[PDB]
Amino acid sequence: DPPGATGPTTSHVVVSNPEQPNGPAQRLEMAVATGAIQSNVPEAIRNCFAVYRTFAWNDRMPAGTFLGSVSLHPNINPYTSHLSGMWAGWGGSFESRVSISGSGVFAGRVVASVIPPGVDPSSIRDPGVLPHAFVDARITEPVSFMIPDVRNTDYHRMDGNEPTCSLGLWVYQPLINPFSTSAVSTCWVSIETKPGGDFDFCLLKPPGQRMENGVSPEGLLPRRLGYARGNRVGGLVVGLVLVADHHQVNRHFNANSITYGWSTAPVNPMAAEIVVKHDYTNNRNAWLSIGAKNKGPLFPGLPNHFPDSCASTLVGAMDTGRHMPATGVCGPAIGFQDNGDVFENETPAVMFATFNPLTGNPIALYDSINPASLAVMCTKSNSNFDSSGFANDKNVVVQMSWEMYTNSQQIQGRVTPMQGTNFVFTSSGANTLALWEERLLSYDGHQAILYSSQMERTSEYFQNDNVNIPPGSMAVFNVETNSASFQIGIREDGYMVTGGTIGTHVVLDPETRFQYVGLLPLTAALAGPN
Amino acid sequence: SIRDPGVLPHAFVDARITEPVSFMIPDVRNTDYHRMDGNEPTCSLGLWVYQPLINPFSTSAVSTCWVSIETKPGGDFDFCLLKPPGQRMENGVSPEGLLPRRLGYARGNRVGGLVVGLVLVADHHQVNRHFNANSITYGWSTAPVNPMAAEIVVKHDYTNNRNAWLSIGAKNKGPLFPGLPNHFPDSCASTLVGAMDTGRHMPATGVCGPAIGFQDNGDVFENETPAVMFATFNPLTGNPIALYDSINPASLAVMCTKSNSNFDSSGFANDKNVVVQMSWEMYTNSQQIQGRVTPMQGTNFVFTSSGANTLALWEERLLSYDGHQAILYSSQMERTSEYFQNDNVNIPPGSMAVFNVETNSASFQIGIREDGYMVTGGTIGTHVVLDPETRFQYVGLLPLTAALAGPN
Amino acid sequence: DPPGATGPTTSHVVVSNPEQPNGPAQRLEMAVATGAIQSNVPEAIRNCFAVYRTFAWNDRMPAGTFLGSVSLHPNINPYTSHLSGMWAGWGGSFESRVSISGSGVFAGRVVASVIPPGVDPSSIRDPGVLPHAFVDARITEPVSFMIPDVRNTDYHRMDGNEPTCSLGLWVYQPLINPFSTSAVSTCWVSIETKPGGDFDFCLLKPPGQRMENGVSPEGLLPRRLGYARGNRVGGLVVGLVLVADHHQVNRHFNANSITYGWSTAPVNPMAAEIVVKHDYTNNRNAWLSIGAKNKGPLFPGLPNHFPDSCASTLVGAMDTGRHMPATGVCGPAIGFQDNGDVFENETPAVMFATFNPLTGNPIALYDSINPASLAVMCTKSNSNFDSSGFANDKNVVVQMSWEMYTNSQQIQGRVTPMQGTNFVFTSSGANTLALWEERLLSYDGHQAILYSSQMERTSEYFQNDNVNIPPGSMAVFNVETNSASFQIGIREDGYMVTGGTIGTHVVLDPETRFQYVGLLPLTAALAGPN
């Protein structure tokens, strides 16, 4: 090869640690444990590299700055991640060439070290203490590193949530430019990846067979954002917020496919029965009591798709204006019989609310959601429900279409709980709980935004399968917007986590792309916004 | 299509056979390899009844035997050319993703109602949200069904003859036809569907839903949300304004269902907007909008089955204004429309993508054309009822002259 | 060779993919099928590289920026492209050396990868997954790549739009200049091409012979713009726009030489006959109903070369000013007799319009173009058409010169349709419908511009031959302007579609050079302006 060009298969292996495991003896261990004597990877994959990451390296990053890591897993090669779906086991080292795109005028060194399993690359504070290699910024040939397979077992389960080795990159000596420019001179560290040598697969399962502890969390987020919808109302996802705590329990599902609420993950309009019809008053509007005849899918008594963004005492108290609760979620109400005979004449605008059943006294808001407390109230101040279509032996289906404030208080992070219910969801440290911004219609010229715990396809994917997110770690995704690229971690609680200050807003266009990285532990610091 | 199976060079297999019998399926090909794109014919292995199955035990019941087929890659089989995994190739994606693995809560492309089953119809005209294998539509709507956002052009007050209504048109902001708003129904009220009656003072048959007025900044008029029928009217009338034959961008309208009410003065002004859903269907006759599609002006799209294969439609489920079941016949379902819309699908113009359909009782075959339309054997008028446990299985590409095992 | 100079034949072949076809065995297969035992290519061409493209590579282009592809075809060597007019088939590989105009101070890499046939190079989302080679910007010796011929068949048809291999170039690590300045430091990637080895031609056709599915799309656009005219009026083409939708049907021809309008592709002046003469009124000027005696060459009744940019209700309402329609394209009218006794005295300034016969009542405007609606008014206030000169048994012909507005609305993307005529033309994704900014003579001191669907030499070229644009593809043209450089794709509908923001204006001087890249599919993303 000429000195400016670099073909495939070309590797200059630098041994960054004189404690490599016996590769072929681990290959013997796999062949004893599974009978995997023959190789399962085509040599077209074993010979050529494939691009995995590229990392920025500025003047303005000091020594010891973590550039990025490459964790050992079959998903860091696209061909190996494709081939892994037919197999129940894997094991073996990878090979990884690093190219640094810096001129011969720069200066600066990168520490590249292989990390033992069970030690987090982002949490290492002293990177030159580990046995490490240096890579100069002036380097021309790409430098290859073996990422060894240090494993307790004879093979890794494809299920297996065990720690593997990583390859970390840190700034050893900062990047400088002799040309005194006030602007930032940027260098690019690209990482490519082979299956190296002793890598093989173990145990034929049929392709796409769901294994024991879940599916891969790659399908939690879309490939690009598009017209994604959140799990509270189904409004359009606008961006992200960083909040301290949150209480969202409707349509929130764990990695164990368990919810704590009463609704199903694809959002539908609320079908419900009419229990007691109420006429309008000089004080308060005409309203209607709601309850299924023990036909709720999760809580029999709570109808499917009742909003937790309804009107309550926790959200906003009633005002002597519109003669109704101030803040809540509204939509039109369609009455229909048991055979589906829709009352087609009127379709009154309607607010979701929880009321105190014990009142009578003018009936006021309740703190929480009780199956005997569910109600819908007219928005029109002096109208009345119709006599035959909204009778006590009828049904109603209501959508969640817009939001009304009648104050300066929205229902952004606010969730109406149930009785005897205290679900709190908190971020620990150097990682913040993140929520999606739904987009409602509003009763004013301002933007109506609710903060939802996850989006609809994340809720359906958690709902329908078990997702292999173990309780110690997160499924981490890269997020590329037009300007900001950052990381999001999804827990096994179903909640989101990313770095930054509580209150940080991100705006996500529908060209926002997500990329599944892998499982990083909860103690890892995610590169957040700003 | 082979009518004489013992004329081909063939093997016999007895019904009394104990060992399984292996056959090589050869690769007779013109080319040096098959493209993974490639829609070229390969060899097949057919099975025909040579001598009929008999039981010496004289039972009136049917004695059934099972012929199971297993498959290796045999010998000289190999793959050729590394593309990256999941790379879309030249003439499309595989049509495996046209239908779901199990039915579930699937929705059709006309209103978005629940898919109940299949019908066999002679012809159909459905052009909204229908996309080809070439990812081309002929209509004006986008494949995920959304509520119709539209402008208010002219507000009309109620009359002793006819209800209060409202004229519709986007300011050249339609995604496909600028002038036709996204998600206007082709199941609207028209002269082709049902003429007006001097009962409800409105068109008889159509699709209705509530109407939400809102401003340009999104300021929703939250007070009233009147029930509303989608209709196309003749703009030239005035004379009491009556139904039109087709859909013209100056003909679009929505009319109150309530017989003597009136649109509000400020929320439904001429500088406002409205968003309406398609929630239920009204008849006011014995004529539904099952296979009926309101066309456009100068538009004649006909979709016909040829022979020994019948055009098939999905049965949507609407809410109804009565105690009967409201069913519209839609050309495809929503995820089929989105999958045709977003990718090119490798269905060549001579063939079909064939699927096995397992319900509780009936298992049959469905062929999807490159037109996006469905095809299966049987008599015109055959109804199938599909529970949400109905499973689909992609078989492959069979030509249009193939006879699909239909229902019954 | 001295280390700074490179002669011909000098190549350092870098292998990017270790799976080349058996070159001399495919050459034997071509000779069995066609009898091409000996070489049909002169050996002066096989020994020397000749230039094909030159790609600009900047600081301001990120990683994964597609620089360009070299698709395998005879038109990528200038000698082989000339020879391919004689031959009906070909087969074999080309050899491609790449030279980068980078100093020794710069840094940056490009990915060179050979792409399998059937895969669009401009649809590859991760460029480095395939087996690739890295070429550095600081390289001195040029690097040679073999572009293999992976093919099902024994040879390629010179017609056949069957896919061949490509050599795509992407930016891997961006180009950086350490001498930091806001100015863009441009690098030049120049690609040269040999016929490599097993390349040959197959079957003699006569030179310049149109083959079965059309001529090449090279002659659609000129080599350089010049004084080019559009097909709406025939005015000077100023530049481009990017419009969402358009309706231009007149003189527009498909790749199958099929038109949907009523005119012929070189714009002649509008030969027309006079049906009913009309005098001037105090409210509106004099006018003249137009209709031939069923002598339109496409729609007999619509006259040859009647404008679509006439005055209509969609264009502009009539004002109580000059007693005529506000916005239209005007011209001087010439009245002549059937044998050639042209009327010499008067020549009225005459605006094109469309009116209503059913009115009777002052006759007003009309929405569309009906063969009874064809009518033109004066520009003067109280003049009148002469008795013998402009009678009911005479003719009239008008040369379109003006463009009047009389409001703030123009006829830019506006086309007047026919009755029973709703044609739309729309792009779908990563690509925007482009149009040609025409030029007329404004009635003001502003610039009077129409947007036309295609130009005359594109309309004439689609007429006289069929053009090899298959229905799933585009014909892509490089646009070498003074400042900008981008791509324009022409469809089989005859419409221009390119990348960029809807509404982007481009100024095209007559030194704008158009250069033909090959055929790309409709789903391909085009590098548009800015």
Next chain:
Amino acid sequence: PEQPNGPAQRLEMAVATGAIQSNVPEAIRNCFAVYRTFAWNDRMPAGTFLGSVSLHPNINPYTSHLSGMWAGWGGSFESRVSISGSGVFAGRVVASVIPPGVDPSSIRDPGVLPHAFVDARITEPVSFMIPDVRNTDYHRMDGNEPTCSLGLWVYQPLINPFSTSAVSTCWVSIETKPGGDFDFCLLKPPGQRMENGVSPEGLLPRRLGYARGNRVGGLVVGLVLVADHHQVNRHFNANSITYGWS
């Protein structure tokens, strides 16, 4: 001036199909049979396309008969062209062999191709070889692949020197052999309909007779020429689709 390797294209077919042996009787390879006769008038100017003979089994009546049993073919035919006209007439006809992928009715320079002048005064016929230049290893019997052709054009117009105002017609005949390396590939049952349809030979009868149109069913008189038409009754596509009700 390039012919394919005849017996080595035959090795490609025996690999791709298993057709190692011959399937055409050798009495057909020795007998020219009249395929088609073209009328050639005074009233056709220079450059008039007379008709092309595309390479297929249907251009020999013995080979079109044999091809009902076979799903594939490949190989060259041998053709000769003869004129039946008086020795007084003046006019040439170019007959040129056309490479595959070129439309014969789009060729504007027939005398540049490998050609032959077939004058009206000719006595012996002009023999041609029509090669099988193909990308593939065989041809599908139903497949509409590009083949080599044999076009005919009026190079010089046919004129009658005597004072005769009537139209004088000349007759161009084409005879055909299967040449040499021609063979068949894949047994289908005899008369088996292949995938994309039957041949269009059976659209019109061998002679008109008492034929009936599809609007009412009256006796067919002859043709007309109309610009546009709307007939939808009893009109069926090649895809066997009608839009009417009868």
Next chain:
Amino acid sequence: DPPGATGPTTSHVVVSNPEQPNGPAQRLEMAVATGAIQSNVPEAIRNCFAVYRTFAWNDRMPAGTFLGSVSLHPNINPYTSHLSGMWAGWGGSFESRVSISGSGVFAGRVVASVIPPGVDPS
């Protein structure tokens, strides 16, 4: 072959009459008279059996019930019947395998006899 499956070309020739003509000597006589020295039949047809008839055989048919005759003609192979539109003469023997769709519980025999020319089988 496995004992339940039968491919093409599989034949167990049972002789019903031990007075066959000299087959290859009659083939030489045909080539003197007509010049048919080489084979006019493709060898794909000579190797495989193709179906001609199917005869129902019941409990309710007594002994001596005529099931059917296979008279020697080109129209008793479907490929040879198609080829015989090209030819004005023929000669030679055909080979006929017979398969009976009987279970192992049934019983019954058929007579197969080759009949001299000039004698009606019925």
